[PDB]
Amino acid sequence: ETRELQSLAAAVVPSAQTLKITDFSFSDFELSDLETALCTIRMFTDLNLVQNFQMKHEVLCRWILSVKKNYRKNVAYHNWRHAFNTAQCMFAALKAGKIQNKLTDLEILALLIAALSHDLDHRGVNNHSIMEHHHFDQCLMILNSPGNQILSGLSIEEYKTTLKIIKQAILATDLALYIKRRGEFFELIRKNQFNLEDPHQKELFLAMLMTACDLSAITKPWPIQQRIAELVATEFFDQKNKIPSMQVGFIDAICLQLYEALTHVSEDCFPLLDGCRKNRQKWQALAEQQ
Numbered sequence: 001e002t003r004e005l006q007s008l009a010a011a012v013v014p015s016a017q018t019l020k021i022t023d024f025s026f027s028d029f030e031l032s033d034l035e036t037a038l039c040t041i042r043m044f045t046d047l048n049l050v051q052n053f054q055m056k057h058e059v060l061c062r063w064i065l066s067v068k069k070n071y072r073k074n075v076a077y078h079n080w081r082h083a084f085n086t087a088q089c090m091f092a093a094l095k096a097g098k099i100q101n102k103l104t105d106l107e108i109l110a111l112l113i114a115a116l117s118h119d120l121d122h123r124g125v126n127n128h129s130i131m132e133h134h135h136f137d138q139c140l141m142i143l144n145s146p147g148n149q150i151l152s153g154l155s156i157e158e159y160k161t162t163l164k165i166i167k168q169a170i171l172a173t174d175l176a177l178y179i180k181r182r183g184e185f186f187e188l189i190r191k192n193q194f195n196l197e198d199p200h201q202k203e204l205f206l207a208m209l210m211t212a213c214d215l216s217a218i219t220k221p222w223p224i225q226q227r228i229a230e231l232v233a234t235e236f237f238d239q240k241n242k243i244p245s246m247q248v249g250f251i252d253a254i255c256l257q258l259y260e261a262l263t264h265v266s267e268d269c270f271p272l273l274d275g276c277r278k279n280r281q282k283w284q285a286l287a288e289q290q
């Protein structure tokens with residue numbers, strides 16, 4: 001054991017309301033690394049994952065520290081904080097968005113692990129789905145490392161089922177796969193044909209839900225979104241006048257239809273769509289000022 005694992009395993013885990021991780025407007029700028037690790041423990045706990053799958057506390061703590069360490073801090077956006085924010089949005093969509101009741105325990109377990117792991121070992125956008133296969137491979141290696149096996153409490157049937165959902169969920173964060181598959185998702189939604197009891201449409205929904213959380217910074221309050229866009233711009237160009245229009249085009253081409261479709265599935269996910277619309281106004285106003 002290191003000093004980090006000792007102090008994290010011995011610390012008090014505040015409640016979900018104290019940590020504000022149920023809010024879609026959650027922000028991590030004021031949190032330390034230890035504090036984000038505590039938020040992650042609370043996410044597993046309040047989703048009943050520690051209870052239903054008999055996770056040892058020090059194993060989960062070791063797993064979280066392994067995932068965090070296998071992100072690169074020198075990468076401006078695709079780092080541990082992006083993975084942590086993606087998982088927080090997944091938690092909020094499950095809790096506040098009331099999506100948790102539409103899914104099974106194994107699907108929730110896999111979505112949370114996938115959200116935290118979907119960009120492992122990312123080197124930056126400057127440095128198919130070749131990358132997402134590497135991300136899942138990093139996730140699988142951590143899940144099998146000694147002392148980090150948070151899935152040990154599962155039977156082989158549950159374990160094999162969970163690994164497949166994790167793999168599909170991480171591969172789904174490839175925007176090319178999202179663009180190829182979202183046409184079917186919007187077809188069913190606009191035809192009042194969408195049904196989650198269908199295994200094919202359920203897996204499609206899990207893919208869209210991964211992308212919605214992956215891009216959720218675009219939905220944040222304007223002071224926060226402006227800060228995240230600064231990180232994205234740093235990674236895109238360094239590792240300004242055209243950024244406002246680029247964001248508007250990104251919101252129109254990618255984000256708006258997704259968060260509108262997600263609101264159709266769950267009305268309580270509307271805060272994501274509403275924050276995305278407000279950010280489009282702010283960016284469009286700046287684009288016209290150039």
Ligand SMILES: CCCOc1ccc(NC(=O)CN2CCN(C)CC2)cc1-c1nc(CC)c(CC)c(=O)[nH]1
Pocket residue numbers: 214215216217218228229230232233236243246247249250253254
């Ligand atoms: C802030 C600096 C500029 O960021 C961007 C610039 C351009 C694009 N365009 C596209 O991705 C694809 N375009 C192709 C041309 N099409 C007409 C429209 C769609 C996206 C971003 C962007 N990507 C992410 C995710 C990493 C985030 C984080 C949520 C973000 O905030 N902005």
Ligand SMILES: [Mg+2]
Pocket residue numbers: 118119131173174
């Ligand atoms: Mg990625």
Ligand SMILES: [Zn+2]
Pocket residue numbers: 082118119173214
């Ligand atoms: Zn990502």
